[PDB]
Amino acid sequence: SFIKPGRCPKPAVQEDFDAARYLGVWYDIQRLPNKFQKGECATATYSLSPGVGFSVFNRERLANGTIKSVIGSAIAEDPCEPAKLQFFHENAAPVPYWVLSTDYDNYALVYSCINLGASHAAYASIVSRQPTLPEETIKKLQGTMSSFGVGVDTLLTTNQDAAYCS
Amino acid sequence: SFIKPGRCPKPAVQEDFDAARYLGVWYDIQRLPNKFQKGECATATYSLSPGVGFSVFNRERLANGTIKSVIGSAIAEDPCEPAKLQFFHENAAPVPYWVLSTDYDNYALVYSCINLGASHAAYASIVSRQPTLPEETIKKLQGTMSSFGVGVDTLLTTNQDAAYCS
Amino acid sequence: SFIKPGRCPKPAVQEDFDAARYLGVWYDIQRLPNKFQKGECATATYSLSPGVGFSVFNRERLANGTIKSVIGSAIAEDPCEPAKLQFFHENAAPVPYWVLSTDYDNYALVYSCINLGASHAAYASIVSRQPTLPEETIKKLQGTMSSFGVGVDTLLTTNQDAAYCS
Amino acid sequence: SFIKPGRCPKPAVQEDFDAARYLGVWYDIQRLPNKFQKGECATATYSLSPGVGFSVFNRERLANGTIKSVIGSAIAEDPCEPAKLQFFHENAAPVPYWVLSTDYDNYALVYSCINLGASHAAYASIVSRQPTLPEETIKKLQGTMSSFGVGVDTLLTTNQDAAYCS
Numbered sequence: 001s002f003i004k005p006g007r008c009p010k011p012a013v014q015e016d017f018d019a020a021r022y023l024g025v026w027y028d029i030q031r032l033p034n035k036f037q038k039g040e041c042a043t044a045t046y047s048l049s050p051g052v053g054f055s056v057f058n059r060e061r062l063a064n065g066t067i068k069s070v071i072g073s074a075i076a077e078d079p080c081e082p083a084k085l086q087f088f089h090e091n092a093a094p095v096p097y098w099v100l101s102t103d104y105d106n107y108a109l110v111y112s113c114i115n116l117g118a119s120h121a122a123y124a125s126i127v128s129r130q131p132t133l134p135e136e137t138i139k140k141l142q143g144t145m146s147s148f149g150v151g152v153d154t155l156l157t158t159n160q161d162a163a164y165c166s
Numbered sequence: 167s168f169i170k171p172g173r174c175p176k177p178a179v180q181e182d183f184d185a186a187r188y189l190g191v192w193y194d195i196q197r198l199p200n201k202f203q204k205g206e207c208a209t210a211t212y213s214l215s216p217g218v219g220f221s222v223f224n225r226e227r228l229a230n231g232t233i234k235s236v237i238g239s240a241i242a243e244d245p246c247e248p249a250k251l252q253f254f255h256e257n258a259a260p261v262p263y264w265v266l267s268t269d270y271d272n273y274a275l276v277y278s279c280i281n282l283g284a285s286h287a288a289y290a291s292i293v294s295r296q297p298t299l300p301e302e303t304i305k306k307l308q309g310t311m312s313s314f315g316v317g318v319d320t321l322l323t324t325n326q327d328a329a330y331c332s
Numbered sequence: 333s334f335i336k337p338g339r340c341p342k343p344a345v346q347e348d349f350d351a352a353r354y355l356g357v358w359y360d361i362q363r364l365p366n367k368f369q370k371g372e373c374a375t376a377t378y379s380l381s382p383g384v385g386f387s388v389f390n391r392e393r394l395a396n397g398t399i400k401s402v403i404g405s406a407i408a409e410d411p412c413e414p415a416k417l418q419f420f421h422e423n424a425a426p427v428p429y430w431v432l433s434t435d436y437d438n439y440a441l442v443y444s445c446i447n448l449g450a451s452h453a454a455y456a457s458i459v460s461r462q463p464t465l466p467e468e469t470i471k472k473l474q475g476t477m478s479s480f481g482v483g484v485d486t487l488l489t490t491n492q493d494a495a496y497c498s
Numbered sequence: 499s500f501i502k503p504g505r506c507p508k509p510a511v512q513e514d515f516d517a518a519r520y521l522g523v524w525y526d527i528q529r530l531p532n533k534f535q536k537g538e539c540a541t542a543t544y545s546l547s548p549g550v551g552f553s554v555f556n557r558e559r560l561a562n563g564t565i566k567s568v569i570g571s572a573i574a575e576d577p578c579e580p581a582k583l584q585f586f587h588e589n590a591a592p593v594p595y596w597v598l599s600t601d602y603d604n605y606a607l608v609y610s611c612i613n614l615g616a617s618h619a620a621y622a623s624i625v626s627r628q629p630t631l632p633e634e635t636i637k638k639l640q641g642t643m644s645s646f647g648v649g650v651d652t653l654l655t656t657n658q659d660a661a662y663c664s
């Protein structure tokens with residue numbers, strides 16, 4: 001999704017990550033530019049799976065008012081690295097999805113990277129259990145992002161205004 | 167997981183494979199020796215996924231009457247190759263799973279292979295919608311297995327006796 | 333390293349591809365935009381490998397006259413699909429490299445693709461044993477490139493002018 | 499190519515591994531049972547690659563005195579992990595090859611593991627720059643292997659007798 005030079009960094013993930021506590025609704029707060037989000041008001045809904053991992057339901061509002069959504073399935077392929085997921089969205093090739101940091105109740109810092117020779121395509125995201133996230137939490141997560149080569153300057157803020165998104 | 171010489175054959179899969187028709191209950195009729203089937207009366211149940219692919223519930227009876235079962239998730243990582251799945255069983259590393267041939271309402275030939283240098287570990291299985299499958303059908307699928315270098319003689323026949331399996 | 337929408341296409345590869353005839357010097361005639369070519373006069377030289385596959389030496393001229401180069405190794409990881417190689421350059425992650433069409437003594441259409449969810453990163457190339465290639469030959473390879481969704485308008489022409497590259 | 503239960507362990511590899519100091523001739527001293535060594539007197543010879551990584555030439559003596567050898571190519575696909583190699587032996591699928599420990603001048607502990615569902619296939623070997631290695635060094639390396647579940651009882655000692663190998 002977003003090309004930067006160098007090979008993919010390998011940042012720390014959430015230690016002892018617990019997926020059952022990660023389920024539910026997360027709101028997109030900030031994110032690296034990508035090719036899949038085409039609007040605003042983005043939310044992810046993660047739910048229990050009857051097999052392994054969990055189901056994914058992403059949803060956003062387009063500027064012309066059209067609502068768009070996708071379904072996918074998330075799986076930790078190595079049970080010993082539960083924070084290192086892979087998402088299989090409908091009609092999409094698999095993408096990595098690592099949870100760098102989360103407190104389950106408020107925020108989460110998500111990272112994703114795929115190698116491209118001497119370059120890489122990266123995606124990063126700050127999400128929240130609410131349409132807003134406190135300013136301090138955001139600055140902290142931006143802080144870790146800098147350590148693995150994401151520029152805070154390059155981030156897009158997602159519109160989560162209550163009126164516009166209903 | 168059966169070690170044989172040579173690299174994994176790359177047999178053909180079922181053309182224009184339709185997972186919705188592959189769902190439901192399958193009985194293990196014959197199978198390559200493996201490390202996971204520990205008894206008899208083996209069935210697989212495939213169900214809808216709210217994400218992609220489908221949910222898996224494999225189940226067998228032990229000699230002492232104890233029922234053993236596992237849950238997992240099946241996903242075709244390349245949507246243009248829907249018959250070439252990957253199974254993510256709980257407590258297992260991901261494994262390949264090809265539907266080489268199926269008519270959906272009667273039989274299916276499942277193959278799975280993993281390379282080990284100049285050797286490979288293979289798993290193959292004939293399943294049926296009924297606890298039995300006609301011998302001529304069994305013979306035909308055995309033909310297919312031989313055509314890509316599996317020995318029919320090494321196949322194990324699975325117990326599906328209504329008396330024993332009830 | 334060029335983003336286009338959709339998953340990677342799988343165009344046909346060169347039949348009975350013979351790497352021994354593909355060795356030697358190729359001149360870049362035109363190619364998709366990428367992050368590795370920074371100048372002109374780009375050439376690829378393919379050489380004997382004492383193990384498997386063959387050796388790679390890429391070379392171009394910078395605008396200030398500085399020559400830049402990389403070495404790498406090409407390996408056909410599956411001997412039965414010899415046209416589907418993996419290229420391992422110094423300081424780079426592995427990249428696919430398919431020889432889609434070549435007559436060995438004149439031209440070659442090179443392709444490479446890596447998936448990015450519902451998008452993909454592509455690189456495509458028309459190379460030649462001479463610094464120029466006939467207009468009729470280029471158009472044919474353009475017909476093929478068009479067939480998997482690269483537009484001739486998106487292509488860059490490589491400077492192979494004898495004076496300037498000298 | 500030796501099947502054990504559980505997923506592949508992830509042992510530490512030699513820190514700051516230098517492939518350049520690893521070149522030349524190593525003798526097989528002890529090894530896990532595998533499918534490729536058919537005799538004795540086995541040596542691996544590693545040499546410069548004109549591309550990336552290094553060149554591979556393995557050879558052993560068969561019981562009937564006939565000598566057999568293979569060539570391949572070794573590559574660290576992740577340059578930041580030079581001890582984590584991939585070996586491409588001729589006509590074989592790629593295999594992992596980790597250097598867990600080496601002092602370059604005397605010994606080396608090589609490990610390799612490929613997952614097979616809830617089981618795995620492993621290969622490990624203690625090599626030496628001489629046909630023999632001191633018992634204390636061997637014991638030390640056997641110690642390391644034990645910590646990740648290879649049985650010292652399962653190890654085979656390789657015949658490197660000077661006369662028999664002459």
Ligand SMILES: C=CC1=C(C)/C(=C/c2[nH]c(/C=C3N=C(/C=C4\NC(=O)C(C)=C4C=C)C(C)=C\3CCC(=O)O)c(CCC(=O)O)c2C)NC1=O
Binds near residue numbers: 444445459
């Ligand atoms: C997404 C896929 C992808 C591919 C395929 C790819 C090829 C590739 N070409 C490279 C160097 C190079 N490659 C070329 C040119 C060629 N390269 C060719 O495959 C051919 C046919 C030519 C034509 C001669 C040149 C000239 C260099 C060196 C340029 C320089 O470093 O200044 C490198 C080394 C890394 C770098 O210098 O940044 C890679 C990885 N990179 C990718 O990200």
Ligand SMILES: C=CC1=C(C)/C(=C/c2[nH]c(/C=C3N=C(/C=C4\NC(=O)C(C)=C4C=C)C(C)=C\3CCC(=O)O)c(CCC(=O)O)c2C)NC1=O
Binds near residue numbers: 069
């Ligand atoms: C390079 C890596 C990479 C990733 C990680 C990735 C995720 C991804 N997000 C998607 C949809 C979506 N994704 C989101 C939003 C999110 N998505 C998230 O992973 C998170 C955390 C949010 C935050 C809420 C939304 C709203 C959609 C639906 C978009 C639409 O239909 O327009 C899709 C589906 C494909 C599509 O319809 O275009 C993919 C593959 N794609 C990639 O190429």
Ligand SMILES: C=CC1=C(C)/C(=C/c2[nH]c(/C=C3N=C(/C=C4\NC(=O)C(C)=C4C=C)C(C)=C\3CCC(=O)O)c(CCC(=O)O)c2C)NC1=O
Binds near residue numbers: 285533611620
């Ligand atoms: C599951 C992982 C796995 C590994 C790692 C592996 C290594 C491996 N060793 C091979 C040959 C060989 N390998 C060796 C010896 C060695 N090989 C070594 O990795 C080392 C350290 C030595 C020590 C000297 C020899 C002597 C041969 C040649 C066998 C012959 O031709 O008789 C081959 C070629 C296949 C063949 O033709 O038989 C492979 C794939 N195979 C696997 O399945």
Ligand SMILES: C=CC1=C(C)/C(=C/c2[nH]c(/C=C3N=C(/C=C4\NC(=O)C(C)=C4C=C)C(C)=C\3CCC(=O)O)c(CCC(=O)O)c2C)NC1=O
Binds near residue numbers: 193194235258
């Ligand atoms: C290298 C290849 C390879 C494959 C394919 C594989 C499948 C596989 N089958 C499993 C359980 C199982 N698998 C089955 C039966 C089936 N399974 C089928 O794919 C089909 C068609 C049936 C027939 C109905 C059953 C009944 C179980 C549960 C067994 C138990 O509880 O012990 C498991 C779970 C973990 C384990 O017990 O090892 C795996 C990984 N394992 C491998 O190593």
Ligand SMILES: *[C@@H]1O[C@H](CO)[C@@H](O)[C@H](O)[C@H]1NC(C)=O
Binds near residue numbers: 062064065066
């Ligand atoms: C907005 O855009 C989408 C895709 O471009 C389109 O399908 C949809 O109909 C548009 N909504 C309108 C015009 O209401």
Ligand SMILES: *[C@@H]1O[C@H](CO)[C@@H](O)[C@H](O)[C@H]1NC(C)=O
Binds near residue numbers: 231
């Ligand atoms: C049946 O078998 C398994 C092991 O084979 C054992 O764990 C289980 O307790 C047994 N149950 C009995 C004795 O019914």
Ligand SMILES: *[C@@H]1O[C@H](CO)[C@@H](O)[C@H](O)[C@H]1NC(C)=O
Binds near residue numbers: 394395396398
């Ligand atoms: C050529 O230009 C590149 C641009 O970065 C630079 O790396 C290099 O120093 C230049 N060579 C010179 C100054 O001769």
Ligand SMILES: *[C@@H]1O[C@H](CO)[C@@H](O)[C@H](O)[C@H]1NC(C)=O
Binds near residue numbers: 560562564
């Ligand atoms: C020795 O035995 C091997 C098989 O065991 C055989 O292939 C080889 O040719 C034999 N060597 C000779 C010439 O006796």
